[PDB]
Amino acid sequence: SGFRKMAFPSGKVEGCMVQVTCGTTTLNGLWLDDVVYCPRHVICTSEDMLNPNYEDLLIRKSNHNFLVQAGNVQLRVIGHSMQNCVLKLKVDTANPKTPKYKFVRIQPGQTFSVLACYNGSPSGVYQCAMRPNFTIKGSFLNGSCGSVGFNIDYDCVSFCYMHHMELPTGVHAGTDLEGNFYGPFVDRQTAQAAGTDTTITVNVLAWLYAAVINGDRWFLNRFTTTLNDFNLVAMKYNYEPLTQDHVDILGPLSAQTGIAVLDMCASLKELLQNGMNGRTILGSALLEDEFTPFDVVRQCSGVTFQ
Amino acid sequence: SGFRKMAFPSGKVEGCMVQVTCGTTTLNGLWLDDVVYCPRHVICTSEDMLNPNYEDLLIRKSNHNFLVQAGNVQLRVIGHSMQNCVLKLKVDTANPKTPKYKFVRIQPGQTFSVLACYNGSPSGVYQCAMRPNFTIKGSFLNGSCGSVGFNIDYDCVSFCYMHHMELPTGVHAGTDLEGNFYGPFVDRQTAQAAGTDTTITVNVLAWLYAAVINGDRWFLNRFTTTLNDFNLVAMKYNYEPLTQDHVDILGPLSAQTGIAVLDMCASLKELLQNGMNGRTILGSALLEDEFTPFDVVRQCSGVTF
Ligand SMILES: [Cl-]
Ligand code: NA
C-alpha cells in the first residue's frame, strides 16, 4: 500500500556523469562507452548567446580545448562532433560503468526520472513528466545543464532527456540524446516562452484507478459518458483530449478494478465540477497528472483492495 | 528554479542490496563489510508470527539455512546472531562496494530516502518523513521487507530505516539499523495501529520559505506573532509545537527572504484559519510537511554527493 512519486534507482546513471569544461563554461556530460554527450552550448561565450553559429564556433576548437573530468580523473578527448544540439566528445577510455542502455525520444505525457547534477556530481533524483507544451517542471539551478532523464524498465537504461535551459516561467527545456529539442525551443537566448500548458487527462485517469486499487471509491458515481461528451467537458478545464489510444491503454487498469474507462471518465467529470469537498485522493487535494498508466501498474498491487 | 520532492542519489546503497531467503520467506538484506542485515522475522513461519519466540526460533537455524544472493552469486553465511529486531548474517566475503557509512537513529520530522527493493533488486527510490506517530507513508508491496532508508552527507551514507511491516491504514513501520523499532510496534502478528498523527510545523514553515524563494508570495502579510500565541493555534490544528530551536534552524531562510519566522507563522496562522481561497503553493493545495529546513537549503543551493 501507499503511493509515491517514485523514481528509478539512479546508480546506473550516476556512474556515467562527468564534468565538461570549454573556455570558462562548465556543465555536465554523459559518458557512455567511449563517448561523452553534452549540450553544444558549452562552446558559447557571453556574446555568443543570442545568435551563436555553432558550426563556426566548433571549427575553432581542438580536442584539447575540451576538459572532461570523471571524478578525479581527466579523460583525453580524441575527437568531437556535433549532432543537432548535442556535442559528442570521443574519449580514449570506454566508461567501465556503462550500463545496458538505449536512447528513446518520448511523447508528451510520458514520465521519467531526472538525476540533477552539478560539476559532474549527482545532487538528487526526482520524477518528471513531459508536459503537453514540451516543457518539464524540473528543479534545476545554474550548472545543471547536461543532467539527464531516464527510465529503467527491465535493467536497461532508456535515456530520454538532456537538460539545456530554463524558460521565463521557471520550467525547463531540453533535448533527446540525439540532440533534437522537445518542442519549438532553440539553444539561443532570444525571447522564447512555453505555450499554455494543459493537464494530462490519461494520467489523471490512471491515478484515479490507482486510488481505487489502493482502496478508495468515494469519487465514483453511477453515470457514464460518451468519449466525445467527455472531451467537450474536459477541454473546458484545460484538459488534453482523451483519445481511443488512451482508452485502450487504460484497459488493464479497468479490468483490474472492474470500472469501465468511460465510467471513470464520468467520475473525473464530476470531480472537476465539484472538487474534493475537503477530501484527498492518494494524499493530494489536486488531481495529479504525472503518473502514467504504466507507472501505476509498476507501483501498485495487482490485487485491488475491494 | 523549481522545487521537487527529491531523493538522494541511490547508487551507493544499490550496491549493498542482497536477497535473503530462510525457508519459504524471501526478503531483502543490507550487505556492509562482511555482515548482511535483515529483519529477524525472516526466520518465522506464519504460525510463529502469531506469537514468536525469536531467541528459540534462531537457535534451531544453521548457517546453511540462510540463502544469501548478491546478484547471481551466493554468499556463504558463516555466522548468525540477532540484535534487537535485526538479524546479522556474517558472510565469508566483505562487500567490495561498501560505502563509507554510519547507522543513525532519526527523530520524527526528519526526512530520508527509501530504496524500495524486491528479491534483492532495487526497484524505486522516493523521499519520506518519519511522522510524529513514528510511521512512514511509504509505498511498499509484499517482498519489500528489508528495504532501507538513508541520508547522504558528502560521501557518508547514514542508514536510518529498515522496513518491517504495513499497518492496517496502509502506512509503514520499521526499525533503525540496530533493530530498534520507531514507534510502539512489534514484529508479531497482533492487533496494531497507527496513532493519530500531527503535522510537522517546522517543515511546513521550511516549505513556505521554499515557495517564497521560488516566487510564490501571495500568502505573505504584514503581521507577526509570538511563539506562545502561534503555539495555541498549532495545538488547535493538530500541528506539532514550534520550539525556539526550530526558529533558530530556520534563521538562514528568514535572513535570505526578509520574512522572520514569527512573520511566516502569521502567514501559516492565516492559512490554517482561512484556507488557501482556491490558490496553490508550489503546486500543492495542501500544506506540505515532508521537507526539512535542510532539504530546502540543500535543493535551493545545489549540494552534491
Ligand atoms: Cl513515450
Ligand atoms: Na506576516
The β-bridge relationship of strands A25-32 and B121-129 is unpaired
Report how far residue A93's alpha carbon sits from residue A89's, in angstroms, rounded to the nearest whole number.
11
Q: Closest approach of chain A CAs to the CA of B90, in angstroms?
A: 26
CB B5 within 8 A of CB A126: yes
Residues of A in contact with B168 (CB under 8 A): none
Residue A199, beta-bridge partner list: A239
Q: Which ligand is nearest to the CA of A158?
A: 1
Report how far residue A28's alpha carbon sits from residue A177's, in angstroms, rounded to the nearest whole number.
14
Please report, as a single letter, which amino acid is at residue B205.
L
Please report, as a single letter, which amino acid is at residue B80.
H
Which residue's C-alpha cell is 494530462?
A200
Give the single-character DSSP code of B257: H
Distance (Å) of CA A35 to CA A79, A222, B246: 9, 57, 48
SS3 call for B187: coil
Q: Closest approach of chain A CAs to the CA of B171, in angstroms?
A: 7
Q: How far apart are the first and last CA of chain B?
A: 20
Cell readout for A243 is 483519445
Distance B258 CA to ligand 2 centre (A): 11
The experimental resolution of this structure, in angstroms, equals: 1.5
Burial class of residue B181 (count of CB atoms within 10 Å of its CB; 0-12, 13-18, 19+):
middle
- Render chain A in DSSP notation, one character per residue: ------BPP-HHHHTTEEEEEETTEEEEEEEETTEEEEEGGGG--GGGGSS--HHHHHHT--GGGEEEEETTEEEPEEEEEEETTEEEEEESS--TTPPSEEE----TT-EEEEEEEETTEEEEEEEEE--TTS-B-----TT-TT-EEEE-GGG-EEEEEEEEEE-TTS-EEEE-TTSPBSTT--SS-S---PPPP-B-HHHHHHHHHHHHHTT--TT--S----HHHHHHHHGGGTBPPPPHHHHHHTHHHHHHHT--HHHHHHHHHHHHHH--TT--BTTBSS---S--HHHHHHHS-SS---
Distance (Å) of CA A131 to CA A173, A184, A185, A287, B65: 10, 13, 14, 15, 51
Residues of A in contact with B284 (CB under 8 A): 284-286
The β-bridge relationship of strands A17-22 and A66-70 is antiparallel
Among left, alpha and beta (phi > 0; psi -120 to 50; other), residue A294 is alpha
Output Rg (C-alpha) for chain A, integer angstroms. 22
Which residue's C-alpha cell is 514540451?
A134
CB A295 within 8 A of CB A288: no
Burial class of residue A237 (count of CB atoms within 10 Å of its CB; 0-12, 13-18, 19+):
middle
Does A215 sit within 8 Å of B139, measured CB to CB?
Answer: no
Give the domain ranges of chain A: 1-14+100-197, 15-99, 198-301
Does A7 sit within 8 Å of B125, measured CB to CB?
Answer: yes
Calculate the dihedral angle through the C-alpha atoms of B10, B15, B16, B19, rounding to the nearest 10 degrees.
110
Angle at alpha carbon of residue A134, lines to A129 and A136, rounded to 5°: 40
SS3 call for B97: coil
Dihedral sign of CA atoms A109, A300, B152, B216 in order: positive
Q: Closest approach of chain B CAs to the CA of A57, in angstroms?
A: 29
Please report, as a single letter, which amino acid is at residue B245.
D
Report how far residue A174's alpha carbon sits from residue A147's, in angstroms, rounded to the nearest whole number.
10
Report how far residue A80's alpha carbon sits from residue A36's, in angstroms, rounded to the nearest whole number.
9
Report how far residue A35's alpha carbon sits from residue A16's, in angstroms, rounded to the nearest whole number.
10
Report how far residue B264's alpha carbon sits from residue B205's, in angstroms, rounded to the nearest whole number.
7
Which residue's C-alpha cell is 468519449?
A227
Contacts of B266 (CB under 8 A, 6+ apart): B221, B223, B224, B225, B230
Cell readout for A195 is 505555450
Does B125 sit within 8 Å of A9, measured CB to CB?
Answer: yes
Listed in sequence order, the DSSP H helices in B127-200 are: none
- Nearest by CB to residue A124, choosing from B7, B11, B115, is B7
Does A124 sit within 8 Å of B2, measured CB to CB?
Answer: no
Interface with chain A: mutation pick from B3, B8, B10, B295, highest number of A CBs within 10 Å: B10
Nearest in space to A159 (alpha carbons), one of A85, A88, A117, A103: A103
Which residue's C-alpha cell is 479497468?
A254
Enclosing H/E stretch for B265:
helix B261-274
Distance (Å) of CA B5 to CA A115, A279, B87: 13, 22, 32
Distance B262 CA to ligand 2 centre (A): 7
Does B305 sit within 8 Å of A126, measured CB to CB?
Answer: no
Cell readout for A159 is 535515456
Residue of A nearest to B124 (CA): A8
Distance (Å) of CA B83 to CA A163, B13, B101: 46, 21, 18
Give the single-character DSSP code of B63: G
Please report, as a single letter, which amino acid is at residue B187.
D
Q: Which CATH superfamily is domain A15-99 in?
A: Trypsin-like serine proteases (2.40.10.10)
Residue B129, beta-bridge partner list: B111
Cell readout for A71 is 571524478
SS3 call for B28: strand
Residues A41, A163, A164, A172: which is the catalytic one? A41
Report how far residue B122's alpha carbon sits from residue A99's, in angstroms, rounded to the nearest whole number.
15
Give the single-character DSSP code of B291: -
Question: How many CB atoms within 10 Å of residue B259?
Answer: 23
Residues of B in contact with A119 (CB under 8 A): 304
Q: Which CATH superfamily is domain B1-14+100-197 in?
A: Trypsin-like serine proteases (2.40.10.10)
Residue A115, beta-bridge partner list: A125, A148
Question: B23-29, long-range: CB within 8 Å, 24+ apart, which pairs?
Answer: B23/B65, B26/B119, B26/B143, B27/B143, B27/B144, B27/B145, B27/B146, B28/B117, B28/B118, B28/B119, B28/B120, B28/B143, B28/B144, B28/B145, B28/B146, B28/B147, B28/B148, B29/B68, B29/B89, B29/B120, B29/B146
Contacts of B236 (CB under 8 A, 6+ apart): none
Listed in sequence order, the DSSP H helices in B220-260 are: 227-236, 244-249, 251-257
Name the packing angle between helices A227-234 and A261-274 (round to 10°): 30
Question: How many CB atoms within 10 Å of residue B40?
Answer: 21
Cell readout for B216 is 510564490
* Domain B1-14+100-197 matches domain B198-301 at the CATH topology level: no
Residues A44, A117, A145, A265: which is the catalytic one? A145
Report how far residue A161's alpha carbon sits from residue A26's, in angstroms, rounded to the nearest whole number.
19
- In chain B, residues preceding a discontinuity (C to N beyond 2.5 A) are none
Does A9 sit within 8 Å of B14, measured CB to CB?
Answer: yes
Residue of B nearest to A11 (CA): B11
Distance (Å) of CA A225 to CA A205, A228, A262, A288: 14, 8, 6, 21
Give the single-character DSSP code of B275: -
Distance B208 CA to ligand 2 centre (A): 12
The domain over range A198-301 is classified in CATH as 1.10.1840.10: yes
